Amino acid sequence: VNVPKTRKTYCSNKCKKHTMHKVSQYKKGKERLSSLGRRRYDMKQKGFGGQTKPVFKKKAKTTKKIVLKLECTKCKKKRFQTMKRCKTFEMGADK
Amino acid sequence: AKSKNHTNHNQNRKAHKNGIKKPKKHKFMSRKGLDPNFFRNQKYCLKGIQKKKKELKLKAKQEKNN
Amino acid sequence: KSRGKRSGTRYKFSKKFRKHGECTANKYLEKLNYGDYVDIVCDSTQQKGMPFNYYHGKTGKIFHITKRGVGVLVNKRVKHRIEQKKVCVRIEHVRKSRCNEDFLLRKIKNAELIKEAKLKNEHINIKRKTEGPKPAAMIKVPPSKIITIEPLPFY
RNA sequence: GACUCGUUCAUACUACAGUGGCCACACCAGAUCCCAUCAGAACUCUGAAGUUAAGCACUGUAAGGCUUGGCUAGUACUGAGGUGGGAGACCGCUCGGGAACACCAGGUGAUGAGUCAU
RNA sequence: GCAGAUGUCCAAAGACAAGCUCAAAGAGAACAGAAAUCUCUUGUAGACUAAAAGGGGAAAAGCUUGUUUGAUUUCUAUUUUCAGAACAAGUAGAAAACGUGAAAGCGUGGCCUAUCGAUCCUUUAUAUUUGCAAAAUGACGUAAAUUACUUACUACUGUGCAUAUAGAGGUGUCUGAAAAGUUACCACAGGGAUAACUGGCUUGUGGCUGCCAAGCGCUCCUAGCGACGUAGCUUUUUGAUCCUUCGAUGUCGGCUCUUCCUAUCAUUGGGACGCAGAAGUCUCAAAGUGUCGGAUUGUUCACCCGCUAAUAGGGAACGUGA
RNA sequence: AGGGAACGGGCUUGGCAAAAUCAGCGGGGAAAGAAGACCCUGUUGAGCUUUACUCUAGUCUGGCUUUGUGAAACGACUUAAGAGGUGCUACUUUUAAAGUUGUUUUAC
RNA sequence: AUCCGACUGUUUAAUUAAAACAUAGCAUUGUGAAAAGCCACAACUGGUAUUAACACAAUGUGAUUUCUGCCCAGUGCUUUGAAUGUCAACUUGAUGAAAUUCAAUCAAGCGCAGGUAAACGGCGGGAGUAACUAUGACUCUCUUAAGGUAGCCAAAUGCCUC
RNA sequence: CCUAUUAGCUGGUUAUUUUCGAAAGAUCUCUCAGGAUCGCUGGAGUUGAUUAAUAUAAUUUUACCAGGUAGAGAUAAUGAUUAGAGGACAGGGCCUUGACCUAUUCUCAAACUCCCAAUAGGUAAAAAGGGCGAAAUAACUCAAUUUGUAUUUCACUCAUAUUAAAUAAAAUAACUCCAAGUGGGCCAUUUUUGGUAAGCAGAACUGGCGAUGAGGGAUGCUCCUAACGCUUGGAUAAGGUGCCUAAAUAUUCGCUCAUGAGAUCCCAUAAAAGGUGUUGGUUCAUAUGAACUAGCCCUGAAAAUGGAUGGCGCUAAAGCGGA
RNA sequence: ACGGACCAAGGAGUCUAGCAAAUGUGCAAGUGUAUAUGAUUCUUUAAACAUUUUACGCAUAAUUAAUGUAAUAUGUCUAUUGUAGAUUUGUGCCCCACUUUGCAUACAAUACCGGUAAGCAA
RNA sequence: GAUGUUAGGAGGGCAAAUCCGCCGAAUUUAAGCAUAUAAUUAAGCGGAAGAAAAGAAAAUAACUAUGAUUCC
RNA sequence: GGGUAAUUGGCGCAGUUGGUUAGCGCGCGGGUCUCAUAAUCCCGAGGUCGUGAGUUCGAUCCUCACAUUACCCA
């Protein structure tokens, strides 16, 4: 799957025209220790009792859905676009 | 043990026991998602019709009640 | 184990012998109005707006018209009851239904008969006749025309 | 007689042969321009010397195909009944419905709107 | 059950438009051949269309070229499964902004039918939308007034966190637990919904009896056989089924004892012979009488030694364990 | 014998069928025992085993505290100067032994 | 005469008395001591121990005779380390208004490098080849950590197998 | 003692009459001995009908649709497949071997189709509506403020006296609420998949058994008749009429002799192959010889306690086929 | 197939909490007087009786995560609009067709409230 | 610190329904199960009274503000 | 995912702003005789892309590629 780095498409925020967007790949980003869920999980894990929440270990599928971050070059507003899942994904590779 | 996977036996008898119900077939159907720019115009038509009719009736009522 | 959209439509959605090819240009000129009856026959040459397998050959009255599509209300039998189903198809997959044409012609002809009957002050039967037993007939036939039939031997 | 836009989408198709032309179609003359290519072949543009040779129209063929009818045939098959037959496989009867291939014969179109020429 | 296919692939293999027509065959052209390129004729698709298969497709849905990002944001009416819930996958539309084409139009991914995922949690985007429980934090910002706790007016106000909305991180047992064995020491609740035995139906397998006649039988199909085929009987084998029994029908063999069948091993009386006699083989009526001693093995089965007239085959809940 | 949940004491069709008793007997009552111990099921257990999941006693190690009194060495920090490349200024090294802290050894 | 166990002894009270257990003999392992080994205990404390390597503790094998082969790759166990990667709390430093967020280091363990099989254990396959035939001393080849050695056998261990 | 722990599992679960009356499908489920949820059922209630209509209908007629199963075909396509016949690219010695082409030919397909039934299925058959006009309204549509569309209001009027086809103990309707049980099914006819087959496994339609007795099939959960308050008469169905056993040793016409006759669907087995037994037909040869044919009978036809057209028995039938 | 040798007596859908539906009853935009108090009531009486003119529950208003906001709209004490529809009114005290009125309810259409989009936004 | 048959006194045990401290499960529910639930319960140890315990704000609110504890 | 190292000649290998270097593998000449072996020469995207900089494989950054440790709430 090849996707060009830029794309002239509809802007859905702060502009309502077809503007040039720079495209990139969304990344998950690290979970922070101060999030409410993480704090609750850590407090629960304290003490005796062992593991208190399920740990998933089936792992059926092998790929992930590809998410494109589109940034409008005018308003610098980011937007998300979901691609079909694929094994190989390059951005702006050779034609 | 092995289970009887499937059968349609007696289903027709069950269906016909309370008859094959027919749809009620009302006179008016909701126009919620049908032909906008047409049913909006119909709304305007109806609003104008009520305006003219009610203003005629109000004129008659005023001239008859003094 | 297989219940796709077009499962089991090998022959139903296939074009007739020597009748392949896209729909005729004249079909796009067909006139459709709200509330009139319409037949749902799937044209395989046009893929978008294709009706589901079940509704091929069914009839229903139009409840919606769009730029290139028709929403038609069709009765579907589900176990213990019939229920109304709004199926949305394209123009190519719909055709004017002749399920009413005898009724329409009867209405026109009966009206123009009732007018003249009332004009002449006559009582007429306007209902259909459901013809049954024929009257006695007094028929003639040449003797050279009667032929004697007897069962044939085996061979 | 002819043309344009259609309808039906083979009775309209295909092969071979014959006949037909004043404008009408067309073949045909040319490449400066618009345009187009390896190639003015095509496409596009400008023409009017020549020709029905072809396209096109009409016709023909113990022509193929297609189409209508007959016949296959009440045959094949089939709905309902049977304390019907038969060891069975299957096959009648009663009340009903009813094909197909093949073969035979005929046919090879009709038509809406508009326009041109006489 | 049968033949398969899916967990993908594609910035083009998506969108639009234009032009063109494909597979194959024949004929012809230096190298040049069955195949390499070119030309002509025929060519209803016999090609191609990502993949399985089935549909669809010829001035195209195929090939080539040009321009593009509609594979975009938001929302309805709905179809398939169906409870007419959800997901998912589609269909017809509407509000924006675009692409393409001269235009009519077409385009909300792939010509159509498959190609996928809840809550909670996390993550990153959006927001003139909100909160963090007595308050403030852009900022004394802008106007006036004095030595103040002055007065009016400002969409835009700290870190962190939490919220709302939208995608994503996955549950393939795919409407979605975080999960290795063994019990021949075993326990409990049950199950004839379910095995191991008889019995029952079926009889592939086993055994037995027919039909035909190519041949064998020195010649001669049928004295005796009978291949290639084909019709049956039996439940004496093993199968197949799971109908009865799991609040229990004591599941191998032998010993003992009785009875029954005949598909007769001997004995009785016959018929045939490829019958000189002798011995034998085929066969009929016939179940009255009889069918043994031992070595090895738990064996049934088997195999030897020996007698015999003969040492036949079977059944009786695989007869028979109060 | 039949049919029947496919092995009846009862049902159907037959054979038959004549009081009361004694002693034996082991064919049948699919005889008695006894909620099958084999097999399967149960989101019922238990014993046992492991590189099943999650923990835990014990054990190894580090930190803080108990923990006091001295010495030395080394390191680091702070400060003044020299040199290197280097845009009034920015970074590296060396020089003091100047003040602060940590470590390692050692003494009581 | 064969098999098993050397023997005396012990055992499943009420289905198994044995070839099972024990045994002497053999071998291995830990430990030099109250900061040791092994073990008990909630703590305090204790058993061995009124003990001290000719001892105590933990194992395997199982008289004698004759032997006890090869493999440290795997898994265990164990030995050395400032060359050494990884790591927690703590500590230190930077930033910040602070919470925080970032970095840095001499633990053990693992990893790295060794040792160990009377530790758990393991210990191959194709072809060709000798004046009859047969077989294959011999040769070639694949391959392992090592390719089952001395022995022994249709053994209470061999299906095929009567 | 916690503790009457828990049990999707086994057992039990106590008066009468009357009325209504099931399911053993389906979806999801760490689900397959369970549950929830639809469906089927009861009770309650309202709206309706009570106007021989209308709503309505497991029905038909009329009109119009859709189909690719049975059948048919191989020369129509694909896939097979047997043979020859005619006719100008290859090998050897004008000839041989073929290939190939043309027209034929034998035989086939659940995953083949030129064609294509029967049955099954759908829509429509007028009054809250239709037809025909005018006038208004709209921001819609159109080139159209007068093009169209839709709506509204006025007009006129479209069988109804049998009712816009027939028939209808059609309102015993429609709707709403609450809730039980059920969610192991099985059998018969017809169709069909796997299997050699099965009282086998799995499906389709309808009817039954379950949940249900009565008469008959001797006997029998499922067959035939027929479904059920308590009675008196009558007459029948299925099936029978020799006796068991109510009713014919009835009448009338044929066939059959069996030293293992035969005798009512399900049903309680019988085949290939034979017969110079007898009965009736068909076709050839100068009442003879043949060859066929199909009725009954016979051989083929052997199993274990003693034995079963139900028993007795029956042959001028009490058997078989009719009337 | 399992339980039942016999007889007597005992023997199993109940109680409470909480919700809903159904029906009866009272009152009704209100309803329930909670705890408690008073009062010649004090065997019964542990029940009955009572409650100086914004306690609390439920209802009377919804919607949103939420700061919050919150239902025609003052032209009119009219009370949104249709199609069916009960009842009523007249003409052809006992049929029906026209008028008249238009409950309940059903099917729609409209407004308006809260939230979300979109447009504008001092 | 000791020691005292110095003088005068106190504690010890029983009893628990209510009460006050400690210690502390599992059955069970989740239709499995591990956090959770059972439950700050049962069992265990200790200590009082006719009541015990709590109690005179390092309280609540955010209002026009309330005013120890306990109980309904 | 966090931390670490690595892949440059056919082999292996260490090396960093005024640099692609070597031993082994390959080719001939010559040679001290037969080897050795001086030397030329075959063998390099310094893993890949981007970035920094009179003067980089080099300095920074991202990608997959390998090996111990370590984290494994939908």
Curated annotation (Swiss-Prot), chain A:
InterPro entries: Ribosomal_eL44, Ribosomal_LSU_eL42, Ribosomal_zn-bd
Cellular component terms (Gene Ontology): cytosolic large ribosomal subunit
Predominant cellular place of this UniProt entry's protein: cytoplasm
A molecular function GO annotation: structural constituent of ribosome
Keywords: Cytoplasm, Ribonucleoprotein, Ribosomal protein
Compartments where found: Cytoplasm
Example of a GO biological process term: translation
Origin superkingdom: Eukaryota
Assembly with partners or alone: Component of the large ribosomal subunit. Mature ribosomes consist of a small (40S) and a large (60S) subunit. The 40S subunit contains about 32 different proteins and 1 molecule of RNA (18S). The 60S subunit contains about 42 different proteins and 3 molecules of RNA (28S, 5.8S and 5S).
Family of this protein: Belongs to the eukaryotic ribosomal protein eL42 family.
Function: Component of the ribosome, a large ribonucleoprotein complex responsible for the synthesis of proteins in the cell. The small ribosomal subunit (SSU) binds messenger RNAs (mRNAs) and translates the encoded message by selecting cognate aminoacyl-transfer RNA (tRNA) molecules. The large subunit (LSU) contains the ribosomal catalytic site termed the peptidyl transferase center (PTC), which catalyzes the formation of peptide bonds, thereby polymerizing the amino acids delivered by tRNAs into a polypeptide chain.
The protein's name: Large ribosomal subunit protein eL42
Source species of the chain: Plasmodium falciparum (isolate 3D7)
